[PDB]
Design a protein around this ligand. Structure first.
Ligand SMILES: [K+]
Ligand SMILES: [K+]
Ligand SMILES: [K+]
Ligand SMILES: [K+]
Ligand SMILES: [K+]
Ligand SMILES: [K+]
Ligand SMILES: [K+]
Ligand SMILES: [K+]
Ligand SMILES: [Mg+2]
Ligand SMILES: [Mg+2]
Ligand SMILES: [Mg+2]
Ligand SMILES: [Mg+2]
Ligand SMILES: [Mg+2]
Ligand SMILES: [Mg+2]
Ligand SMILES: [Mg+2]
Ligand SMILES: [Mg+2]
Lengths: 100, 96, 125, 206, 84, 115, 150
RNA sequence: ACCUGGUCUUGACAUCCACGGAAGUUUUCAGAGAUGAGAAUGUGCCUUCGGGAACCGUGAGACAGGUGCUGCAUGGCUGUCG
RNA sequence: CUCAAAGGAGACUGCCAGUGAUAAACUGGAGGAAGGUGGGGAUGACGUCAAGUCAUCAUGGCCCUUACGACCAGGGCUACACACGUGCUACAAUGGCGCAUACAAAGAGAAGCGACCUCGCGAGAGCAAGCGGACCUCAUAAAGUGCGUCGUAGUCCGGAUUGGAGUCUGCAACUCGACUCCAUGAAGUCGGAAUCGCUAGUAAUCGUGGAUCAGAAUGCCACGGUGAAUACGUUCCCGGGCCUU
C-alpha cells in the first residue's frame, strides 16, 4: 500500500482515540429516551462537528507488514499472504497445516 | 481450594508443567490433572497473490487445556506453587 | 446383574444395560414406541433380541445421545448386541453372522475446498 | 509444480517453531508485530554476524530472544558490550524487559540459512553463480550432510532471460516427513535484478 | 430510514445557511454539497443548489419536497439511452 | 357474497375469500373475521346475510378497493411530479429500490427487447 | 467399471412385511432421502390395493411385478454408418429394478390427487395388464422381437 | 487506486541541519471540508543550573513520494498437465 | 458408564485353502471394530504453458517530481437497448398452511456474546445476570412426527415488483444497507439446440456455525440430520500411461 494510505490509517486511529470519550457522551445523549429533545438535537449537531476520522468505522484493518486492505485476519493482524509466509517459517506460535 | 487452569499450544509442554505442579503440591491433596477439551481454531487462506480461489492452505492452532485441583492447600503448598516456575509457552491461571 | 454394552453409530452413542426381565425396553426414560416414532428405528432396536429369541426374557435400560433417530437406533442395536454377548458368549457367532457385531464406521465426509459438498463439484463450462 | 514449504510441513513433527509463546487473541497480533520488528532489527544489526535463526520466547511479561550465530564472539562483543546494546534496543522495541541469549552454530556449512546467505553474498560480489553453488554442495557433503540441494533463480550472469539452475548431492527426500530437512532462502540484489537462492540440507531421518 | 428517535438529519452548516437566508430575505441560491441533509419546512421557498458530483443543481424547495433528502432532486448519473 | 363493491367466492373459507378484496391480506382478513366473531374456516355461502353485513362493517374500517387504488396512484403521481430520483425511476419504468439494472430487472423492464 | 470390483450392498427388509423387494421399491419411490414419507405412500397404496385385490399386499405387489417385468431388452451397438439395437436377456435382479422403476414412473405421471392413490391405481392396472408401466414392458418386448435378427 | 471541484509543494510519509517554541489542553469565527485567522490554558522531563531529548513548529536543500510502465528484465508466491 | 485428552494396543497378506514359474502375486476363507491402500486429508517428481501476479510485497530498467506526489468535499466503482458464466427461489399435494411435539454436530465471544424480566404485531427497545467460557451467552436445529385444513387452481402454488409505515448500525443509509409490519401479488404449470455433477454415508435434500465485518451473503469455508439409484460390462466416444510402427 502507498505510504500515504498507511499514514491515513495512523491519523484515523489517533483521532478515534482522542475523541472516543466525547463521541460516547454525545451518542448516549442521543440514544437516551429521557434526554430532552433539545438536548438530543444539540448532541446530533455536535457529533457532526467532530472530525469524521474520529469515528472508528472510518478505520480499515490493514496488514501490519504491507498495509494490504483486503484478506486481513484479526487474530494475526496480517493479510493472508504475510500470514502464510510467517506460518511456514514457524514464526506464528502453535500454527501448522491442518487435516481432518 | 486452589484451582489451576493451564493452557498451551503444545501438549507435551503442558503435560510437563502439570506434572511439576502436582508433584510440588504433593510435597496438599490434588485432583487430576483433568484433560479439558482442546480448542482447535482453524484458518483458511488463499495461497496465490492473485486469483486461483480454489488454491488454499488450511491452518489450525490447537489450545490444550488442563485443570488441576488443589484441595485443603497448605500455606507451604501455596507458596511452593507460587515459587515454582513453569516453562514459557504455558499460560497459568490460579483460582482461589 | 446388569450386562452393559456401548453402541456407536454416526454421531450417536448409546449405553445399554440388560438384566433378566419381561420384554421391557426404556430409552432415555421413555418407551421404545414413545422415543422412536419410525417403525424402522423400532425394528433396528428389536433386531438383536429377535435373533437371539430373548425378546421377552430381558429388560433393557438404554440411554442414547447425539446424532439422529436412525443413528441412535443403530447405536442402540450395537450396544444391545454387545450386552447380549456379555450375557452369553455363544450368541456372538449368530450376531456376527447378522452383522450386528460390526461397528458401522461410515461418517459424514468433510466438505473440501473448491467443492460444494464432499464430492459435489461446481458446474463446469 | 509448486512444492510445500519444507520447514512448514515438518512443524511439530521433526521441526520446532521459531516463536514459542502463548497469547490470547487480544495480544496475539501485537506479539507477532513485536517479534517481526525485533527480528527485523537483529537481522540488520547482525548482518555480518552470520545469524542463522532468531528464537523468540515470551515468559511472563518478559521477552527472551535466542540468537543462533556461527560467530558467537562478534555478536557478544567485548565483555558482552555488543549483546547489552542489542538487549536495550530489543527491550525498547518489545516494550517489555528483554533477555538476549547467544547460541553458537557449529558447522555453518551445514546450516541452510548460512549457506544461502553466503551464496547471495558471493553473487553480489559478482562471483560466478555455478562456482558458488558447487562449493556449497561440496562443503556440506564434506561436513557429513546426508544430502544437499541448492537452487539459484534469476538473471544468472546478468542474462536477459532469467533461468533456474540447481545442484543436488546425496538424498533430499522432501516427501518424507520424518526426514530432517533444513530449508532456507536468501535474495541477492544485483545490478541486473534480484536473484533467489534456495538451500535444502538433509541430516537424516528423525 | 433514520430512526424517528434520532430525529431528522441536517448538516449544521446547511442549517445555519438556511436560517441566515430566511432572516435576510429572498436570496441567491444556496450552494451545498450536503445531499444527505433532509429538507425542512423553513427551506420551502428557497432555491438550494445541490452538488451532483460535477455541478450544483438548483432545487426550488416546495411543501411536497419536505421530508426528502436534497440529493433526491439532483441526479448523479447521466443516461440518454443506448443507441440513442 | 358482495362486499366492498366486489363479489367474494362463496366456496372458499372466509379467511381466504376476504383476501379477494383489494387492500385485504391474510392478516387483515383474520382481524376482520375476529372482530365479526366469524370463524375463518366457515365458507361464505354458509354465512347468514346478517353475518355478511357484520363483515361489511369491518371491511369499511380499512381503506380498500378503489379508495386504496386512488391513494396508491396519487402517491406514485406525486413522486413523478416531484422529479425525485424515485419519480424518475417510475417514469423510466426502471427499479426504484436500488436493485441492479445491468442484468435482471425484468419485472420492471418487461420482456427482453432485442437490439 | 473397468475394474469390475463392485460388491452387493445390504438392504434392510421393509419393517411391516419384512420384504427386501418392498424395501427396494420404497428406495425407488423415495426422493431427497425422505424414506419415512416414501414408506407411508407405499404402505397406504398397498393397503388400498389389497382391499380391491382381495389378496395379501405382498401377493398383490408380486402380481403387478410379474406383468411389468421384462424378459428381454435392447442395447445399442454402432455398426459403421448405422446403429443396431441388439436384444439382450435381462438378468433377474435387473428385471425387478426395471419393473419397479417403470411402475413408479407411470404412477408419477398419473392424474390422481395423491401419490398413494396414483401408485395403487398403477399397481392395480398392472395386475390387469392395462397401465403405462405394462405398455413400456410391451414396447421393450416388441423392440427386442423386431431386432431378434441381431 | 477513478471523476468533478476546492487546495499543498522538502511535502501525507523518513533521515539530516539551523532556528523558535514543552508536548499538549480547552474554546471562537469563516469555510463543504481541506484549511486559515484567533483566544485561553498548560510549559514539563533530563538537567556536568553546559545541558540535552519528548514533541510541536519555521527555513533551506540533499531528498521524500508514485496502486505510474515493463509478469516479455526479475525474486517470491500460484494455476496447469496430474 | 458416556465423554474429555494424554499414553498405549490393534491389520501384518499375519493365519488357512486354492492358483501361480518350488516367484512376485492373485482368489476365497477364518478371526476381528476394522482386511488386503479399512474411510477422508495433508503430501504434487524432471519439466510444460515467455501461463498468472511490477496493484500484497520485493526488485533491474524506464518515467513523473509546485506533479503521474499530497490533502478535502461530493460523485463513481451499484449506470442498462443487450449477450454470457456461477448461483438462489420456484413452478406445488413425496406439497402449502395451522397447531402440537422429537432427535445433532461444529463453532464464536470482552469497544464482545448477552440470559431473565418488562414493552412492542414485529424488526427491536429498556433493564440487567452470567461468561475471556466442557460452567455463561449466541441458541430455535430443520427435514421429521401427530392432528387438522387446502383439492389440482396460476391455486391457501410462487413471492418478483411497487405504495405506505417502521427498526437498527453508522458523523451520515438520496444516489446506495440490512431488517420488520400492512398492503400489493409479476414471471413461472418443469424448460430448444446443447450441457454439468455424482460410485456411499456419496448424490439428493434439511437445517447449524465461522472468517471478513460498525452495518451489509443466495458467495466462500466448515458442521452434523435424513439418505438413495446404478455399474451387465468395455463394442463405442473422450482423455491418460506403457510397448511397437
Ligand atoms: K387481497
Ligand atoms: K514469476
Ligand atoms: K518495477
Ligand atoms: K443500482
Ligand atoms: K446466488
Ligand atoms: K445507502
Ligand atoms: K457484520
Ligand atoms: K505411437
Ligand atoms: Mg469498514
Ligand atoms: Mg451434509
Ligand atoms: Mg467458485
Ligand atoms: Mg510469465
Ligand atoms: Mg505472458
Ligand atoms: Mg472521498
Ligand atoms: Mg464491482
Ligand atoms: Mg506403467
Amino acid at each position: 500500500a502507498k505510504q500515504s494510505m498507511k499514514a491515513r490509517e495512523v491519523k484515523r486511529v489517533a483521532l478515534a482515540d482522542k475523541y472516543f470519550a466525547k463521541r460516547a457522551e454525545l451518542k448516549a445523549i442521543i440514544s437516551d429516551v429521557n434526554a430532552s429533545d433539545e438536548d438530543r438535537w444539540n448532541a446530533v449537531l455536535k457529533l457532526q462537528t467532530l472530525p469524521r476520522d474520529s469515528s472508528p468505522s472510518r478505520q480499515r484493518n490493514r496488514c501490519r507488514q504491507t498495509g494490504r486492505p483486503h484478506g486481513f485476519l484479526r487474530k494475526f493482524g496480517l493479510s493472508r499472504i504475510k500470514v502464510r509466509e510467517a506460518a511456514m517459517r514457524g514464526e506464528i506460535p502453535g500454527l501448522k497445516k491442518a487435516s481432518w | 481450594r486452589i484451582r489451576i487452569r493451564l493452557k498451551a499450544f503444545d501438549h507435551r509442554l503442558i503435560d510437563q508443567a502439570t506434572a511439576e505442579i502436582v508433584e510440588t503440591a504433593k510435597r496438599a491433596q490434588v485432583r487430576g490433572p483433568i484433560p479439558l477439551p482442546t480448542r482447535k481454531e482453524r484458518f483458511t487462506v488463499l495461497i496465490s497473490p492473485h486469483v486461483n480461489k480454489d488454491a488454499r492452505d488450511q491452518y489450525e492452532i490447537r489450545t490444550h487445556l488442563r485443570l488441576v485441583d488443589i484441595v485443603e492447600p497448605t500455606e507451604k503448598t501455596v507458596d511452593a506453587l507460587m515459587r515454582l516456575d513453569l516453562a514459557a509457552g504455558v499460560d497459568v491461571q490460579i483460582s482461589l | 446383574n446388569q450386562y452393559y454394552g456401548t453402541g456407536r453409530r454416526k454421531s450417536s452413542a448409546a449405553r445399554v444395560f440388560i438384566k433378566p426381565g419381561n420384554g421391557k425396553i426404556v430409552i432415555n426414560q421413555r418407551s421404545l414406541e414413545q422415543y422412536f416414532g419410525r417403525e424402522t428405528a423400532r425394528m433396528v432396536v428389536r433386531q438383536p433380541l429377535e435373533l437371539v429369541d430373548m425378546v421377552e426374557k430381558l429388560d433393557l435400560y438404554i440411554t442414547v445421545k447425539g446424532g439422529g433417530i436412525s443413528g441412535q437406533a443403530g447405536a442402540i442395536r450395537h450396544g444391545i448386541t454387545r450386552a447380549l454377548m456379555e450375557y452369553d458368549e455363544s450368541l456372538r457367532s449368530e450376531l456376527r453372522k447378522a452383522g450386528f457385531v460390526t461397528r458401522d464406521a461410515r461418517q459424514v465426509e468433510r466438505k473440501k475446498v473448491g467443492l460444494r459438498k464432499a464430492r459435489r463439484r461446481p458446474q463446469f463450462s | 509444480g509448486q512444492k510445500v514449504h519444507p520447514n512448514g510441513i515438518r512443524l511439530g513433527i521433526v521441526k520446532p517453531w521459531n516463536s514459542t509463546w502463548f497469547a490470547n487473541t487480544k495480544e496475539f497480533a501485537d506479539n507477532l508485530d513485536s517479534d517481526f520488528k525485533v527480528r527485523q532489527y537483529l537481522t540488520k544489526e547482525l548482518a555480518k554476524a552470520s545469524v542463522s535463526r532468531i528464537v523468540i520466547e515470551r515468559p511472563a511479561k518478559s521477552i527472551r530472544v535466542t540468537i543462533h550465530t556461527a560467530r558467537p564472539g562478534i555478536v557478544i562483543g567485548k565483555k558482552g558490550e555488543d549483546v547489552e546494546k542489542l538487549r536495550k534496543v530489543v527491550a525498547d522495541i518489545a516494550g517489555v524487559p528483554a533477555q538476549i541469549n547467544i547460541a553458537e552454530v557449529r558447522k555453518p556449512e551445514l546450516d541452510a540459512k548460512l549457506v544461502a546467505d553466503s551464496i547471495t553474498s558471493q553473487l553480489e560480489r559478482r562471483v560466478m553463480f555455478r562456482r558458488a553453488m558447487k562449493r556449497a554442495v561440496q562443503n556440506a557433503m564434506r561436513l557429513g550432510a546426508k544430502g544437499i540441494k541448492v537452487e539459484v533463480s534469476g538473471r544468472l550472469g546478468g542474462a536477459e532471460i532469467a533461468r533456474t539452475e540447481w545442484y543436488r548431492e546425496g538424498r533430499v527426500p522432501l516427501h518424507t516427513l520424518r526426514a530432517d530437512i533444513d530449508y532456507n532462502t536468501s535474495e541477492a540484489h544485483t545490478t541486473y535484478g534480484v536473484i533467489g537462492v534456495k538451500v535444502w540440507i538433509f541430516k537424516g531421518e528423525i | 430510514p433514520r430512526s424517528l428517535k434520532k430525529g431528522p438529519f441536517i448538516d449544521l452548516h446547511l442549517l445555519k445557511k438556511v436560517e441566515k437566508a430566511v432572516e435576510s430575505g429572498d436570496k441567491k441560491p444556496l450552494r451545498t454539497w450536503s445531499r444527505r441533509s433532509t429538507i425542512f419546512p423553513n427551506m420551502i421557498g428557497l432555491t438550494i443548489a445541490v452538488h451532483n458530483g460535477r455541478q450544483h443543481v438548483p432545487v426550488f424547495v416546495t411543501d411536497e419536497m419536505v421530508g426528502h433528502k436534497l440529493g433526491e432532486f439532483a441526479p448523479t448519473r447521466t443516461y440518454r439511452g443506448h443507441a440513442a | 357474497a358482495r362486499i366492498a363493491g366486489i363479489n367474494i367466492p362463496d366456496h372458499k373459507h372466509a379467511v381466504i375469500a376476504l383476501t379477494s378484496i383489494y387492500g385485504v391480506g391474510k392478516t387483515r382478513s383474520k382481524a376482520i373475521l375476529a372482530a365479526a366473531g366469524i370463524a375463518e374456516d366457515v365458507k361464505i355461502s354458509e354465512l347468514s346475510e346478517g353475518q355478511i353485513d357484520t363483515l361489511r362493517d369491518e371491511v369499511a374500517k380499512f381503506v380498500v378497493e378503489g379508495d386504496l387504488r386512488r391513494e396508491i396512484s396519487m402517491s406514485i403521481k406525486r413522486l413523478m411530479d416531484l422529479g425525485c430520483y424515485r419519480g424518475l425511476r417510475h417514469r423510466r419504468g426502471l427499479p426504484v429500490r436500488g436493485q441492479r439494472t445491468k442484468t435482471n430487472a425484468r419485472t420492471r423492464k418487461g420482456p427482453r427487447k432485442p437490439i | 467399471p473397468r475394474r469390475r470390483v463392485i460388491g452387493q450392498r445390504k438392504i434392510l427388509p421393509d419393517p411391516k412385511f419384512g420384504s427386501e423387494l418392498l424395501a427396494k421399491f420404497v428406495n425407488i419411490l423415495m426422493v431427497d432421502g425422505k424414506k419415512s414419507t416414501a414408506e407411508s405412500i407405499v404402505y397406504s397404496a398397498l393397503e388400498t390395493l389389497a382391499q380391491r385385490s382381495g389378496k395379501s399386499e405382498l401377493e398383490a405387489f408380486e402380481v403387478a411385478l410379474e406383468n411389468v417385468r421384462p424378459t428381454v431388452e435392447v442395447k445399442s451397438r454402432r455398426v459403421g454408418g448405422s446403429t443396431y439395437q441388439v436384444p439382450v436377456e435381462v438378468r433377474p435382479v435387473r428385471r425387478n429394478a426395471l419393473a419397479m422403476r417403470w411402475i413408479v414412473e407411470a404412477a408419477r405421471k398419473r392424474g390422481d390427487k395423491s401419490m398413494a392413490l396414483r401408485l395403487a391405481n398403477e399397481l392395480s392396472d398392472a395386475a390387469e395388464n392395462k397401465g403405462t408401466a405394462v405398455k413400456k414392458r410391451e414396447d421393450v418386448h416388441r423392440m427386442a422381437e423386431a431386432n431378434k435378427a441381431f
